[PDB]
């Protein structure tokens, strides 16, 4: 799922290619910082200056609008606004865009095509906020242009620019283990699959070729170098594990599945 997105927190702004952070903001100089050489994508130095400026102008006018309507709406200091915005590419289809705003920890208002619509949850207070945000349609057009035109042109150049890093295949390292006991008389079997890239992986407990349906995937867990770590578990009774095995499938393996036996 090829997505690029930006997040604001109100102060930190950053750019993410899914779980991978690619851009960070420097307020000390009002410039965009590139975490990877290829973070520049297919944009030029001129164009990045323009975008630097674009964000600065807009980031300010925006968070100054809140302060402008601070009393008119809700709760005053301290406050937390979270914003996420971006695009996703689809093979064969039209690209997605999103721009969403949360008031404290809950959905507030979001941008749909060319205007702002409230969430029902946020009730009447968000309604008033959208009459405010939608009064100048030209401002909305710009938002639209960035979301549904700028962003997709970028994410293409960006994926292209970092192919040698994103198209990288890192083989996983796998081992078996006990987990904490589910209960009396029973074992939790754990299959650890560690250090792999990219994220999609298939792990399953197997008595022969019969997939065990009780196989539980845990969270996919990150480490600093961008690789992933995943535990697949199965709760079996004490004498019923001798003929079980964990099978790992991955793109790096190129056919050759990892098969571990409990034995």
């Amino acid at each position, epitope marked *: 799922p090829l997505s690029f997105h930006v997040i604001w927190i109100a102060n930190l702004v950053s750019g993410w290619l899914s779980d991978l952070q690619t851009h960070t903001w420097d307020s000390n100089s009002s410039t965009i910082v590139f975490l990877w050489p290829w973070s520049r994508g297919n944009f030029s130095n001129e164009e990045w200056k*323009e975008l630097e400026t674009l964000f600065r102008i807009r980031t300010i006018r925006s968070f100054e609008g809140i302060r402008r309507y601070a009393h008119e709406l809700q709760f005053e200091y301290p406050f937390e606004i979270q914003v996420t915005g971006g695009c996703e590419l689809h093979s064969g289809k039209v690209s997605g865009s999103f721009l969403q705003l949360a008031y404290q920890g809950s959905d507030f208002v979001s941008f749909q095509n060319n205007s702002w619509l409230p969430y029902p949850v946020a009730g009447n207070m968000a309604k008033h906020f959208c009459k405010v945000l939608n009064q100048n349609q030209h401002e909305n057009d710009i938002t639209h242009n960035l979301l549904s035109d700028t962003c997709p*042109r970028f994410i293409l150049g960006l994926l292209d620019a970092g192919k040698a890093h994103l198209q990288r295949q890192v083989k996983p390292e796998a081992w078996l283990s006990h987990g904490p006991s589910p209960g009396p008389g029973h074992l939790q079997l754990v299959c650890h699959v560690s250090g792999f890239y990219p994220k999609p992986v298939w792990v399953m407990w197997m008595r022969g070729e019969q997939e065990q349906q009780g196989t539980q995937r845990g969270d996919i867990l990150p480490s600093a170098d961008g690789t992933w770590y995943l535990r697949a578990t199965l709760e079996v009774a004490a004498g019923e594990a001798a003929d079980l095995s964990c099978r790992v499938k991955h793109s790096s393996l190129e056919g050759q599945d990892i098969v571990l036996y409990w034995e």
Partner: T-cell receptor, first 115, second 112 residues
Framework: AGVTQTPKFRVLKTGQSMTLLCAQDMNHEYMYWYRQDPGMGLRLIHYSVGEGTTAKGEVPDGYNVSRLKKQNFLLGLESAAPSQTSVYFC??????????????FGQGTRLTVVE | KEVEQDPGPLSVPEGAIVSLNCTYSNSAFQYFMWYRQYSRKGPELLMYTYSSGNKEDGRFTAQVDKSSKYISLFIRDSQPSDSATYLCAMSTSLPNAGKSTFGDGTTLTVKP
């Protein structure tokens, strides 16, 4: 008060130099120097995205520019040629307008270069 | 080739609806402007629209059709006062360096 160009007419001898001054008091970041020859449209000579920087347009050869303040944008010819006989337009706009795109234009400078 | 505007000239009789048009080949165009230039004056901005749609302002209607890459300025009940040169201009999506491409202009004369 708008965009102002000085001079409005000028006659040069081949080889001579002149400077055209464009001025705007609208606090615009972008400024432009265009030339218009019949039968064509506007073509961009140079432009500037803000105080202190300038950039080339389509036909920058034989011209130079200066962005001295936000307010002023200078077009210079260091050695006038017959092909620079034309009308020169200056324009400006905000970097990021709130009332839509489109630029404000000066009234033109007719420059005739003669041998 | 990036912006093509019919050169004309156009001489139409007073009262006629006049259509000025440009076609473009760059699908990245998103901002569409019409300028009017009276003889020996500067271009004045006449109509602007963002992306596809119609915007109406009095006797003027500006239309952009992105799938046809074809934009138009219509003038209802053309008056002699409408005699001028009409330039279209277009910009790509952000970032666009603030630049726009101009068509070579259409000269319109409205005979009284």
């Amino acid at each position: 008060a708008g965009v102002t160009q000085t001079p409005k007419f000028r006659v040069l001898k081949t080889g001579q130099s002149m400077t055209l001054l464009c001025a705007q008091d609208m606090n615009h970041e972008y400024m432009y120097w265009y030339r218009q020859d019949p039968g064509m449209g506007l073509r961009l000579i140079h432009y500037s995205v803000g105080e202190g920087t300038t950039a080339k347009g389509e036909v920058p050869d034989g011209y130079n520019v200066s962005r001295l303040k936000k307010q002023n944008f200078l077009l210079g010819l260091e050695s006038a040629a017959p092909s620079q006989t034309s009308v020169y337009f200056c324009a400006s706009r905000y970097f990021l307008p709130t009332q839509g795109m489109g630029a404000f234009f000066g009234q033109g400078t007719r420059l005739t270069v003669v041998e | 080739k990036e912006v093509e505007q019919d050169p004309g000239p156009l001489s139409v009789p007073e009262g006629a609806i006049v259509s000025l048009n440009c076609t473009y080949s760059n699908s990245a165009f998103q901002y569409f402007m019409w300028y009017r230039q009276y003889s020996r004056k500067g271009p004045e901005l006449l109509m602007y629209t963002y992306s596809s749609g119609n915007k109406e302002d009095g006797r003027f209607t500006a239309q952009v059709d992105k799938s046809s890459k074809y934009i138009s300025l219509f003038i209802r009940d053309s008056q002699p006062s409408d005699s001028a040169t009409y330039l279209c201009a277009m910009s790509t999506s952000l970032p666009n360096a603030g630049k726009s491409t101009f068509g070579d202009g259409t000269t319109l004369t409205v005979k009284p």
